[PDB]
Design a protein around this ligand. Structure first.
Ligand SMILES: NC(=O)c1ccc[n+]([C@@H]2O[C@H](COP(=O)([O-])OP(=O)(O)OC[C@H]3O[C@@H](n4cnc5c(N)ncnc54)[C@H](OP(=O)(O)O)[C@@H]3O)[C@@H](O)[C@H]2O)c1
Ligand SMILES: [Zn+2]
Lengths: 42, 318
């Protein structure tokens, strides 16, 4: 699968946002803990 | 509970930039010091809503320092040798912070002074930080010290010292360094994990972390394993080669040359620990507890390395 935030395809554990949509451990975890989507460089 | 205002210096640096992005994103206010507004990162940070930049030098610049700490409750301080005497600077900053009187948590990014734990030399751009740490402790500032592992993104196929993932003609990759190939080194993904971790430390307060040293490393790999990782991601033959000296294929300024020389001796000659501190001699335990969404070498190599190359103007990923 591919992460909807950072678009990675390599992750120790996949996640589901409040929409069942696919997130990576990082993106999903960050959102869960802080409330906002993980901010990406660039 | 409430989001605070964070003072940061060297905003464009990989550690600061990481924190800044995440800090601003969750609602914190950021007062940051940048040496120049010209630059990709600079403009990026310039763009983030609740980020205020102050362009000027840190060396003998107390005025800026005072401004930077006005209304600040937190601070993440991580200097560079490019700015000058890292101790005169690190001391002034800590004094500024104390004068402000509103800092609740002052996280300083520190590094070891190897000549204090063995017959080794003091690595030029690490040891001075350790002196500033002690000074922060001295002032009594509620603090926590972080020791960053070596960045996964130091890697590049370009002719840059110590961390060149060289693209051989036959399409294979080779990494030549003084590091022992079997000895695990502390790694860290600066952009991806520094921000989240520092956030979590701030979120915990000095009530938990005051006076503590934390190893900002999420995984330990031996040169061979690093290569086995790049080789796993790019599906190419990546091999490590231990060389007595650091190869310097381009023109570099003194400080980095001296720095590398010391590295040759400490890691090549003496086979010494990146973190010669008794406390750091798993070291990844605390870091992983603070942030469990870390990015390992494999994902870096696969997901980022290629991209970064591309941006640097390369094309083997095509
Ligand atoms: N790489 C590793 O593996 C590793 C591991 C542990 C600790 N560290 C420590 O990290 C520190 C560096 O911090 P970092 O990684 O966040 O930064 P960094 O990403 O390595 O970037 C270096 C920075 O200094 C700025 N700079 C360039 N010329 C300058 C000048 N003349 N005066 C002032 N600033 C100047 C650059 O800004 P512009 O891009 O805007 O010019 C850039 O942000 C060092 O002390 C190093 O020892 C590195
Ligand atoms: Zn993601």
């Amino acid at each position: 699968t591919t992460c909807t935030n950072c678009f990675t395809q390599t992750t120790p554990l996949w996640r589901r946002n409040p929409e069942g949509q696919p997130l990576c451990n990082a993106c999903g975890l960050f959102l869960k803990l802080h409330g906002v989507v993980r901010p990406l460089s660039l | 509970q409430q989001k605070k205002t964070i003072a940061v210096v060297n905003a464009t640096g990989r550690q600061a930039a990481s924190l800044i992005r995440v800090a601003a994103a969750v609602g914190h206010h950021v007062r940051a010091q940048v040496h120049s507004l010209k630059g990709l990162i600079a403009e990026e940070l310039q763009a983030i809503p609740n980020v205020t930049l102050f362009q000027g030098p840190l060396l003998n610049n107390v005025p800026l320092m005072d401004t930077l700490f006005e209304g600040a409750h937190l601070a993440f301080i991580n200097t560079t040798s490019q700015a000058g005497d890292e101790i005169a600077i690190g001391k002034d900053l800590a004094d500024a912070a104390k004068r402000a009187g509103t800092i609740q948590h002052y996280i300083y990014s520190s590094m070891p002074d190897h000549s204090l734990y063995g017959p080794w030399p003091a690595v030029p751009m690490w040891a001075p930080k350790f002196t500033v740490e002690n000074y922060v402790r001295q002032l009594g500032l509620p603090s926590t010290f972080v020791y960053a592992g070596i960045y996964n993104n130091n890697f590049t196929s370009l002719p840059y010292p110590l961390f060149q993932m060289e693209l051989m003609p036959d399409g294979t990759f080779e990494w030549h360094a003084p590091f022992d190939p079997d000895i695990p080194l502390p790694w860290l993904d600066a952009e991806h994990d520094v921000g989240p971790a520092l956030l979590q430390i701030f979120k915990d307060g000095p009530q938990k972390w005051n006076g503590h040293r934390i190893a900002l490393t999420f995984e330990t790999l031996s040169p061979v394993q690093v290569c086995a990782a790049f080789s796993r991601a790019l599906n190419r033959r990546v091999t490590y080669v231990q060389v007595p000296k650091v190869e310097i294929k381009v023109n570099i300024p003194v400080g980095y040359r001296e720095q590398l020389e010391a590295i040759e001796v400490v890691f090549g000659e003496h086979k010494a620990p990146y973190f010669p501190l008794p406390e750091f001699s798993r070291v990844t335990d605390e870091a992983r507890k603070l942030w469990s969404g870390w990015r390992d070498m494999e994902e870096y190599a696969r997901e980022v390395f290629p991209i970064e190359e591309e941006a640097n103007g390369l094309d083997w990923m095509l």
